[PDB]
């Protein structure tokens, strides 16, 4: 459907309509070129209009993961790579410098195209740029951006998992260990990533997955249910009590809490050896 330009680390997809000199539209927050298509129809008699899906969005696809440092708020990897994508797109489509319009965060991509690859720019428009770096009050706006990201991404996660743990009657030691911040700032970014992945891709999917009581009954002789000695009253123990009630499969108590295997490894092992050694 869309056109493709294969670049280092990505397949860049774009829409193309019209005839005449090339005019590249760079999208803002939505990331995709489809938002420009009604506009392109109005221009297609005068320009070859090109509307880009920036490489992290839409029908574009990465061919290798983002660098770990891209999560750093001062990383320049993505904005420069987006600008290089536009410059390479222009060079692929035109032997002459081209017309470029970016809007909002796409206007910032456009500014980096002019800075890094001026040779591809005939004319350029910055539609409502939100860049703050050169403003006299840059700090105020930078701090507002930093704080809203921190509120939505970090604060929301921290507060939600605390109250969720309490509603499930998770023991304090488990709540602390499952939430404990990594000792390194490289580890804390991974940890956020891992926890958000688990929330979006694991908790709902796994806890409501296709296991029935009859699955337990059929292999009852193979199964041990384990409840921690330090996590009594918590929701997972009620799950085991229900399995036991309906199947007769024994519950064995084992030292520690939800994370008892690392809290009390000697005692945890002693029970496993009684079971299976």
Q: Applying CB under 6 A, which residues contact ligand WKK?
A: 28-29, 104-105, 128, 130, 161, 164-165, 168, 170, 178-179, 195, 203, 207, 235-236, 258
Nearer to ligand WKK, 195 or 247 (CB): 195
Q: Which of 149, 172, 181, 184 binds a copy of itself (CB under 8 A)?
A: 149
Element (H, E) at 136: none
Element (H, E) at 162: helix 156-167
Q: Which of 255, 262, 249 is nearest to 222 (CA)?
A: 249
97 within 8 A of 40, measured Cβ to Cβ: no
**Footprint (CB under 8 A) of a copy of itself, residues 245-274:** 254, 258-262, 265-266, 268-270, 272-273
122 within 8 A of 143, measured Cβ to Cβ: no
Which CB contacts under 8 angstroms, 24+ apart, belong to 143-148? 146/73
Which of the listed partners (Ca ion, ligand WKK, a copy of itself, none) does 88 bind, with a CB threshold of 5 to 8 Å by partner kind?
Answer: none
Shortest Cβ distance from residue 220 to ligand WKK (Å)?
A: 23
Which of the listed partners (Ca ion, a copy of itself, ligand WKK, none) does 75 bind, with a CB threshold of 5 to 8 Å by partner kind?
Answer: a copy of itself
Q: Collapsing DSSP states into helix, strand and coil, what is residue 76? A: coil
Binding mask 3-22 for a copy of itself (x = CB under 8 A): --------------------
Q: Which of 48, 60, 84, 105 binds a copy of itself (CB under 8 A)?
A: 105
129 within 8 A of 108, measured Cβ to Cβ: yes
CA neighbours closer than 13 Å in the CB half-sphere of residue 95: 0
Q: How wide is the angle at C-alpha 61 spanned by C-alphas 80 and 76, nearest 5°?
A: 20
Nearer to a copy of itself, 5 or 53 (CB): 53
**Footprint (CB under 5 A) of Ca ion, residues 65-84:** 80, 84
Q: Which residues bind Ca ion (CB under 5 A)?
A: 16, 80, 84
């Amino acid at each position: 459907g869309m056109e493709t330009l294969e670049l280092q680390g990505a397949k860049l997809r774009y829409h193309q309509v019209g005839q005449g000199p090339v005019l590249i539209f760079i999208p803002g927050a939505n990331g995709t070129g489809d938002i420009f298509l009604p506009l392109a129809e109005q221009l297609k008699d005068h320009f070859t209009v090109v509307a880009v899906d920036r490489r992290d969005y839409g029908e574009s696809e990465l061919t290798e993961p983002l660098p770990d440092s891209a999560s750093n708020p001062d990383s320049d990897y993505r904005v420069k790579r987006d600008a290089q994508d536009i410059a390479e797109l222009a060079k692929s489509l035109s032997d002459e410098p081209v017309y470029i319009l970016g809007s909002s965060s796409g206007s910032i991509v456009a500014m980096h195209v002019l800075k890094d690859y001026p040779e591809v720019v005939k004319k350029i428009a910055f539609h409502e740029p939100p860049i703050n770096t050169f403003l006299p009050d840059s700090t105020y706006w930078k701090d507002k951006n930093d704080d809203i990201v921190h509120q939505i991404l970090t604060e929301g996660l921290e507060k939600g998992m605390k109250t969720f743990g309490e509603t499930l009657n998770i023991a304090p030691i488990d709540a602390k260990m499952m939430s404990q911040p990594a000792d390194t700032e490289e580890g804390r970014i991974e940890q956020y990533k891992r926890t958000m992945f688990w929330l979006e891709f694991e908790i709902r999917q796994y806890t409501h997955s296709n296991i029935t009581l009859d699955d337990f009954t059929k292999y009852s002789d193979k199964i041990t249910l384990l409840n921690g000695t330090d996590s009594r009253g918590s929701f997972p123990q009620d799950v085991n009590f229900y399995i036991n009630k309906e199947t007769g499969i024994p519950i064995v108590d084992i030292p520690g809490g939800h994370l008892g295997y690392i809290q009390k490894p000697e005692g945890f092992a002693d029970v496993l050896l009684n079971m299976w050694g």
